[PDB]
Design a protein around this ligand. Structure first.
Ligand SMILES: [Zn+2]
Ligand SMILES: [Zn+2]
Ligand SMILES: [Zn+2]
Lengths: 137, 263, 47, 113, 66, 49, 45
RNA sequence: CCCGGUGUCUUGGGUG
């Protein structure tokens, strides 16, 4: 019924193996004259409603570095937003998609048209053919 | 009672006829040589720097496929069976590679001949990169252009092909028997005339053809098995045939041990 | 427990010599997020 | 994510016996042998050898599922012989034939060297 | 991307024969004959060299980021 | 979930009552659901995706 | 503090939180984080 | 010192 048997040794030598890339984008938003979000590694003492994942792969600039393996729900971009009227900020960080893993490949840092900070994190992993994957002549 | 007649021979392939054995034994020998004859192969790559255009695990994947001299591998232990902490001189070979391109023009091709053995078992002829001649650069790994550098440390380990095909000491194994189909194990497809439409085996002249009026021998069994064992150079062809037999012996021996101990 | 999230090397077993990170350390059996394959293994503390 | 470790094909867990013999009491003198962490490679070799012995009346095997490296063999012998003993005999015969076979290859090899 | 180390189907090493194949084509040999000289007899091995496409020459033209 | 537990199995679109039958669960490696080949017909299932 | 790399001239330098996002050498406004200090291992499979 | 969760409305392309 239209399935197929594949030679496991062929897969081992590299048949139909492929790279997969995903990019995450984030930027700081403006809420007032001097009220801006800020990239940082958020301290648990000063920021409320933190995510459940690990923050231990972020460097001090709030950005993860290339070469580090990441798994689902790990934070890779730390960002906070202040709470209007210490203990004043709220987490606005971006976790890796729960179903994925791989290696951080490259991190772009720049500014956008409005002058605030702007980052992109590209993650790469390798997908190896397995039971259930689709093929066609 | 088993007899062998070697038709041709050289370093990396032996063509031979095997006779006075059962079909199952010829087949089990075929499978054992492909799957269970141990070899040595890279199994851990520590990348300290890779600024080439190839992805890290892409380069690492090619490294695993490089055939290494595995002649003395029988005295070496499996990593999973060694009593030591981490990795030592008795269960691994350490290899190192470092390449770089200076100059603003041209391309530096990184070849398998730049793999330098650093540490390994004492006086054992293992962990050496396979080479045809002495002026043969070997297998292409990567290519570098100005300011691109590749500096990696590789750990090679003993393994078998059941776990991953890179530990396979043989490529193809040609195998056939009964070139004139006297046993009638196949029923030939034809449009007009079966004999003219099917090509001859390359061993058709090693066995006489069936007499037109000859009666069907329902007691005849397969009895002559011609096979050619090609290798990748990780082991010499004579070693593969010998160690295939040896490995198959211990497996049967292990079964025999367990019956006389379970009572 | 000051052993969580610190980098670890495995010295016995089938995963001997591999890098990992301590993902969860409830008791005796650790969860290492091995760098190589994309999975978190259960492993005893002696290893 | 759900791929099993490939090394599980040949490495035996500590609580799992390499070999397990049970009786089939429904007929006289019949055993079921379960082989753990083994293949067609071993199984087909033993099977044909056993079938040419005059006192083996039934021998068969099946690999129940290729995703699990095991197989189960069924062996029945006539009243005189004990099946488990007959299996030992089949083993020793093949070890001998392969020892002979290894010897004759070595001799022929030096002549072509 | 770059020549595979092994033939996918049978495992014979073909990653050391790529340079030799390009040189033979400069001397005017036809593709079938060039493969014949390299002793790649089974057609599984022949597909590997005959149909590979060398994209790495294109990717290197992009100036190194670092 | 363990051996012999009954579960309800279902393949859209449910056009008739044999689109939902109870099977016994057998835990297995890999990431696909396995069906014995003779039940493909009532589900109008095949294995092309 | 944190190593960066200029997308145009490849000069390496560091930046803390306060400084503007540009290259000191050429003023290029696209920059990239340097490779992490930790060792990376792959199983070559 | 337990507990601990974050989105709504549309457009375009697929899968069966
Ligand atoms: Zn050791
Ligand atoms: Zn081939
Ligand atoms: Zn610059």
């Amino acid at each position: 019924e239209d399935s197929m048997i594949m030679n496991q040794s062929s897969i081992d030598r590299g048949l139909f193996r492929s790279l997969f890339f995903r990019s995450y984008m984030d930027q700081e938003k403006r809420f007032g004259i001097s009220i801006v979000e800020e990239f940082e590694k958020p301290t648990r003492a000063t920021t409320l409603r933190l995510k459940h994942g690990t923050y231990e792969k972020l460097d001090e600039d709030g950005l993860i570095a290339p070469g580090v393996r990441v798994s689902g729900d790990d934070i890779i971009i730390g960002k906070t937003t202040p709470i209007p009227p210490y203990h004043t900020k709220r987490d606005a960080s971006t976790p890796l998609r729960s179903t994925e893993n791989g290696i951080v490949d490259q991190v772009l840092l720049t500014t956008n048209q409005e002058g605030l900070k702007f980052v992109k994190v590209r993650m790469r992993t390798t997908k190896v053919p397995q039971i259930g994957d689709k093929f066609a002549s | 009672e088993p007899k062998v007649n070697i038709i041709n021979a050289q370093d990396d392939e032996v063509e031979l006829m095997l006779s006075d054995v059962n079909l199952s034994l010829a087949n089990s020998l075929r499978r054992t040589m492909l799957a269970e004859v141990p070899t040595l192969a890279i199994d851990l790559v520590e990348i300290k720097m890779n600024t080439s255009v190839l992805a890290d695990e892409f380069i690492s994947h090619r490294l695993g496929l490089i055939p290494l001299v595995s002649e003395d591998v029988e005295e070496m232990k499996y990593s999973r069976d060694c009593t030591c902490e981490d990795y030592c001189d008795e269960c691994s070979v350490v290899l190192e590679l470092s390449a770089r391109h200076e100059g603003e023009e041209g391309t530096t091709d990184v070849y398998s001949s730049s793999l330098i053995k650093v540490s390994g078992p004492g006086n054992l002829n293992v962990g050496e990169p396979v080479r045809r001649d002495d002026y043969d650069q070997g297998i292409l790994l990567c290519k570098l252009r100005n300011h691109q550098e590749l500096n990696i440390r590789c750990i090679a380990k003993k393994g078998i092909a059941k776990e991953h095909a890179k530990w396979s000491p043989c490529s193809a194994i040609a195998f056939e028997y009964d070139p004139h189909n006297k046993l009638k194990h196949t029923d030939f497809w034809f449009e007009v005339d079966a004999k003219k439409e099917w090509p001859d085996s390359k061993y058709a002249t090693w066995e006489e053809p069936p007499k037109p009026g000859e009666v069907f021998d329902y007691k005849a069994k397969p009895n002559r098995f011609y096979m050619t064992v090609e290798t990748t150079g990780s082991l010499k062809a004579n070693q593969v045939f010998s160690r295939g037999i040896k490995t198959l012996q211990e497996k049967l021996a292990n079964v025999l041990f367990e019956l006389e101990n379970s009572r | 427990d000051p052993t969580l999230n610190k980098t670890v090397k495995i010295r016995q077993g089938g995963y001997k010599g591999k890098i990992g990170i301590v993902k969860e350390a409830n008791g005796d059996r650790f969860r290492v997020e091995l760098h190589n394959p994309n999975k978190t293994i259960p492993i005893p503390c002696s290893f | 994510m759900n791929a099993p470790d490939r090394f599980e094909l040949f490495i035996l867990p500590d609580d799992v016996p390499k070999l397990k013999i049970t009786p089939d009491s429904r007929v006289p003198n019949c055993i079921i042998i379960k082989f753990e962490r083994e293949d067609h490679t071993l199984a087909n070799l033993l099977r044909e050898e056993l079938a040419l012995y005059p006192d083996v009346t039934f021998v068969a095997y099946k690999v129940e599922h290729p995703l699990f490296a095991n197989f189960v063999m069924r062996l029945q012998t006539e009243e005189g012989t004990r099946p488990k003993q007959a299996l030992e005999r089949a083993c020793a015969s093949i070890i001998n034939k392969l020892k002979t076979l290894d010897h004759k290859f070595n001799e022929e090899w030096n002549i072509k060297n | 991307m770059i020549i595979p180390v092994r033939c996918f189907s049978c495992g014979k090493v073909v990653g050391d024969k790529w340079d030799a194949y390009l040189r033979l084509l400069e001397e005017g040999k036809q593709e079938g004959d060039a493969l014949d000289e390299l002793k790649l007899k089974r057609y599984c091995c022949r597909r590997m060299v005959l149909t590979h496409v060398d994209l790495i020459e294109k990717f290197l033209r992009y100036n190194p980021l670092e | 979930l363990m051996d012999d537990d009954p579960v309800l199995f279902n393949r859209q679109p449910s056009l008739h009552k044999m689109s939902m039958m109870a099977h016994r669960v057998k835990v297995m490696p890999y990431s696909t659901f396995r069906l014995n080949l003779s039940v493909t017909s009532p589900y109008n299932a095949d294995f092309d995706g | 503090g944190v190593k960066y790399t200029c997308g145009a001239c490849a000069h390496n330098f560091s930046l803390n939180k306060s400084d503007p996002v540009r290259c000191k050498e050429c003023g290029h406004r696209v920059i990239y984080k340097a490779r992490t200090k930790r060792m990376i291992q792959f199983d070559a499979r």
